[PDB]
Ligand binder design. Structure first.
Ligand SMILES: [Mg+2]
Ligand SMILES: [Mg+2]
Ligand SMILES: [Mg+2]
Ligand SMILES: [Mg+2]
Ligand SMILES: [Mg+2]
Ligand SMILES: [Mg+2]
Ligand SMILES: [Mg+2]
Ligand SMILES: [Mg+2]
Ligand SMILES: [Mg+2]
Ligand SMILES: [Mg+2]
Ligand SMILES: [Mg+2]
Ligand SMILES: [Mg+2]
Ligand SMILES: [Mg+2]
Ligand SMILES: [Mg+2]
Ligand SMILES: [Mg+2]
Ligand SMILES: [Mg+2]
Ligand SMILES: [Mg+2]
Ligand SMILES: [Mg+2]
Ligand SMILES: [Mg+2]
Ligand SMILES: [Mg+2]
Ligand SMILES: [Mg+2]
Ligand SMILES: [Mg+2]
Ligand SMILES: [Mg+2]
Ligand SMILES: [Mg+2]
Ligand SMILES: [Mg+2]
Ligand SMILES: [Mg+2]
Ligand SMILES: [Mg+2]
Ligand SMILES: [Mg+2]
Ligand SMILES: [Mg+2]
Ligand SMILES: [Mg+2]
Ligand SMILES: [Mg+2]
Ligand SMILES: [Mg+2]
Ligand SMILES: [Mg+2]
Ligand SMILES: [Mg+2]
Ligand SMILES: [Mg+2]
Ligand SMILES: [Mg+2]
Ligand SMILES: [Mg+2]
Ligand SMILES: [Mg+2]
Ligand SMILES: [Mg+2]
Ligand SMILES: [Mg+2]
Ligand SMILES: [Mg+2]
Ligand SMILES: [Mg+2]
Ligand SMILES: [Mg+2]
Lengths: 60, 92, 59, 102
RNA sequence: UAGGAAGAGUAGUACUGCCCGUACCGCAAACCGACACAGGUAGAUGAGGAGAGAAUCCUAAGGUGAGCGAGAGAACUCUCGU
RNA sequence: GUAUGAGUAGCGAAAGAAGGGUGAGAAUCCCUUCCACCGAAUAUCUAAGGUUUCCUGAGGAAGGCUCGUCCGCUCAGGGUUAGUCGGGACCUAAGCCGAGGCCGAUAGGCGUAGGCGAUGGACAACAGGUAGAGAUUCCUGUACCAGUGCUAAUUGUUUAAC
RNA sequence: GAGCUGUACGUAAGCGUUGAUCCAGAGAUUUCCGAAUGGGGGAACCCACUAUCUUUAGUCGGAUAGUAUCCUUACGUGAAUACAUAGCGUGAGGAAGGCAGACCCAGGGAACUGAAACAUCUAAGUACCUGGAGGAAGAGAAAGAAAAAUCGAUUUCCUGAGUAGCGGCGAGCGAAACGGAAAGAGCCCAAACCAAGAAGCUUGCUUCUUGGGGUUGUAGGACACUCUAUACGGAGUUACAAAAGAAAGUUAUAAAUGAAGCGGUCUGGAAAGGCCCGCCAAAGACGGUAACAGCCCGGUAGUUGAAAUGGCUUUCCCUCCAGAGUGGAUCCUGAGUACGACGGAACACGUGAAAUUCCGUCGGAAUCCGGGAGGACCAUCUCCCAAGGCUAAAUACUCCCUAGUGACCGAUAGUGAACCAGUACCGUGAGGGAAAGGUGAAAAGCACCCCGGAAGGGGAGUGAAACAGUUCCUGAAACCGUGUGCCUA
């Protein structure tokens, strides 16, 4: 959690968008039948939730 | 809502894969998504030129495992055709 | 509505007895009259009972 | 539970009383412990993807934790266990050997 | 007409046009009658020979052989013919 | 829960026959020929209604008044594409709701402006193709209705084109 | 402090001593419908406007906020109609709805039944509908109770007592005070009077606002003077005026430590059981463990523990405060009310000699030498000052949370429901409403062979038991069969 509290609130948006895209490719890959690591989807989806929580509480 | 929440997943079936060489791609979209929001969602993600979009709504089937019966997820399906002078989606 | 603005007079119930005391049911009303009075400095036509109106109110 | 993965165990009761072994797994959700060489069974398994030939298999079965008590690693006898805080940590202390088990 | 007004039309090109329904049965085995029930269910089209006719008998395009059989040819019951 | 009536009544209007095929198993499933039936219907569309019953590959315990290799039955995968069709973003009838308002022990009743409400009014697309399931929707060909930008010249300016 | 990704087997892919899963406190996100509140609507759907921003060459599209009604209050605009009102718009506060099928306050209010019929009466101010709250509500500080003497706010419990009474004097209904207890707490306005302000002109007056005084009965106050106090002292957010804050302690919400038999031996599938020996006990509660355990496990007695939140107590802080006496000129002490006639209702009391309280309609006082009550009423006496308001405790109930108990049930019982129950099913709808528990200690749930398409069997193996094989502990009776000893045309 604290590993990213040092960011400057503007590269977090770049992290929001980068992780959102990766999630889409995983769903695209899983539906086709090419994904062999099905566990990765959950960590990516939690990390999206984690980053939004810090931004929300930074502005209270 | 963002372009990657309008679109959910592709559809790969016997009928869906039959029209790949015809430049028609089948997708699962959100229920509340309109025919226009899908056109701009694809243009943003895949960077192609959409020419025409068709949609249809599917009711939920009634499955039965054991003595408990329920309804399969209600779906909304869209078929997007790209113009001739537009790059093709891998989708393989 | 149907209630004196000044007092609290309004309809009330009771029995209607007769000879041999066959108890029926009935009601009692009030002398509510439609008059124009002053409520906030603005004339208005409202219900005022005749007993209340008999002393101290200006029409 | 007083026993974890890797301890050395002396059994107490059962058809297989008086033997010793090492624990291979723990199931705190049901208070059962799997010990090698203890309480073997015979599984009539149909040929499948796993072990394609199939046959009679000689594997172990879990036993209740109550039928297990830990032995002192150094001196080498079963004993009850106690918790003594030292060095900003909790360790297991034998009530008989008077020494830290771990 | 009251009103509003500095922009207006025409021609030629390219582009844009949302939500719901769309399967299937629908004089029926899928609708209303507890039933794979001799009942009921709005509207459009509804051919030929003879015929005034959507009557009547036999047929065209089209659709069917009806979700227990075979074998004897008594009394009796029902529907028919002398 | 299980008997007697008892292997009894019934098996719900109707013309089938033979030859091949599959199958462990065939009067009942598939194919062929002959015969018979309806034909202002037992034919083709389309509303209400039903809500997956539609298609393909597997199954024969239960359902099918018998049988079953079969099914509107079981399991698993699929299938419904609209500017022009019907309804909304247009309109109103019967009727319903109803700011203020009038009436009334409470609850509430009536009712103006206003708004909903098709069984009616207005409104732009036709012909062909598609052997598993959609067609005025997808594809080919040829159009129409409303709107926008970009060019082309034309034209007009506050007794003020439009 | 070592496993984890629920029920739920199992596959795949992963995460954890850099301390995960898990438990407790505090936060964040919180689609749509629903009082639903931008408009509409057939529940979870449709269609918008005003602003700011975003995208495209532009139409098209997207992001955020605001936009319901009523009540109160200020500002602005403004009709008949000259001023002004009505109306219109904006701004700020409050309300709507739900339920715990419980308790209580009010508005409205049955019949079946009893009287061996029935109408007065009873059932009954019960059932039910509606409105208002509160954790409790209601009542409450004497115009009281009572009589040879006195008591001193209200509420609840025992007796008074089935007494006095009411009653087609029928069926029936049915008190109160004294006495004994639980709990105990008292206060604030109106009016004279003073001061200030304002409007009218009631024209130097009266009628309104505020502040100060002041509230009671062998009368009190205003008014006159004496005495003292302006925080010395007193009180407080449960009434007496009200709004907050700091510190300490204590409690609830996670937890930690915690003694003593692997004792020998017998039966057994397994020992906690029998026999013989020991120990702990502020711990011999409860549950599990292959059978009945204080000494095997989770624990129990005892002793500790809280970063965070909430409650309770105390202190501090804060805030606010005049009360004693003597004279009694004069003035003040709740008016369309107190009562009365008429028609009803509640009081145990049914019009009766009917006192007391309330309602609708008419009539209509005195006011300190005054007024009310003591069960019609008059006189004497005694008690008490109505027509304004507030108030904790003793009392009633349990949709809930924690800790427990039962000479309560044990699957036709106990909740309708021990099980995916208000479910399946029935009805257009309100509504009605079931059946259904048990393998084994452990899945070790029958490898393999034979008959059969399969189901199903016979061997083999697991198991203490398979005559425990996925409705599986025990397995009665009805009912259906096979074989035989005796009898029978
Ligand atoms: Mg469509
Ligand atoms: Mg048809
Ligand atoms: Mg039917
Ligand atoms: Mg049939
Ligand atoms: Mg029929
Ligand atoms: Mg003819
Ligand atoms: Mg004809
Ligand atoms: Mg005919
Ligand atoms: Mg033909
Ligand atoms: Mg017979
Ligand atoms: Mg017969
Ligand atoms: Mg038949
Ligand atoms: Mg044949
Ligand atoms: Mg047949
Ligand atoms: Mg014919
Ligand atoms: Mg339909
Ligand atoms: Mg089918
Ligand atoms: Mg069959
Ligand atoms: Mg059959
Ligand atoms: Mg089927
Ligand atoms: Mg239309
Ligand atoms: Mg209204
Ligand atoms: Mg109305
Ligand atoms: Mg309309
Ligand atoms: Mg119509
Ligand atoms: Mg048209
Ligand atoms: Mg078809
Ligand atoms: Mg066509
Ligand atoms: Mg309320
Ligand atoms: Mg109520
Ligand atoms: Mg009270
Ligand atoms: Mg211990
Ligand atoms: Mg022993
Ligand atoms: Mg036993
Ligand atoms: Mg009277
Ligand atoms: Mg008395
Ligand atoms: Mg009170
Ligand atoms: Mg039983
Ligand atoms: Mg029961
Ligand atoms: Mg129903
Ligand atoms: Mg078998
Ligand atoms: Mg047995
Ligand atoms: Mg047992």
């Amino acid at each position: 959690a604290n590993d990213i509290r040092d960011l400057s609130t503007t590269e977090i948006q770049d992290q929001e968008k980068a992780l959102k895209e990766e999630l889409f490719n995983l769903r695209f890959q899983l539906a086709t039948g090419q994904l062999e690591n099905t566990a990765r989807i959950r960590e990516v989806r939690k990390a999206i939730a984690r980053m939004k929580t810090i931004v929300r509480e930074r502005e209270l | 809502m963002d372009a990657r929440d309008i679109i959910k997943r592709p559809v790969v079936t016997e009928e869906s894969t039959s029209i790949l060489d015809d430049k028609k791609y089948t997708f699962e979209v959100d229920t509340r998504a309109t025919k226009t929001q899908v056109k701009y969602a694809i243009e943003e993600i895949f960077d192609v030129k959409v020419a025409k979009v068709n949609v249809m709504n599917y009711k939920g089937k009634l499955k039965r495992m054991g003595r408990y019966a329920g309804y399969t997820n209600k779906r909304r399906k869209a078929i997007v055709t790209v113009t001739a002078d537009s790059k093709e989606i891998q989708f393989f | 509505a149907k209630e004196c603005v000044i007092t609290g007079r309004k309809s009330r119930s009771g029995n209607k007895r007769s000879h041999a005391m066959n108890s029926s049911k009935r009601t009692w009303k009030a002398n509510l009259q439609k008059v124009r009075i002053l409520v906030n400095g603005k004339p208005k036509k409202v219900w005022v009972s005749a007993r209340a109106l008999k002393s101290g109110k200006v029409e | 539970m007083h026993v974890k993965k890797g301890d050395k165990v002396k059994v107490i009761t059962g058809k297989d009383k008086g033997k010793s072994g090492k624990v291979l797994a723990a199931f705190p959700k049901k208070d059962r412990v799997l010990i090698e060489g203890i309480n073997m069974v015979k599984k009539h398994t149909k040929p499948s993807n796993i072990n394609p030939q199939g046959g009679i298999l000689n594997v172990e079965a879990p036993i209740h934790v109550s039928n297990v008590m830990l032995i002192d690693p150094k001196t080498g006898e079963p004993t009850r266990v106690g918790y003594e805080v030292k060095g900003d940590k909790k360790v297991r202390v034998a009530k008989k050997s008077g020494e830290v088990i771990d």
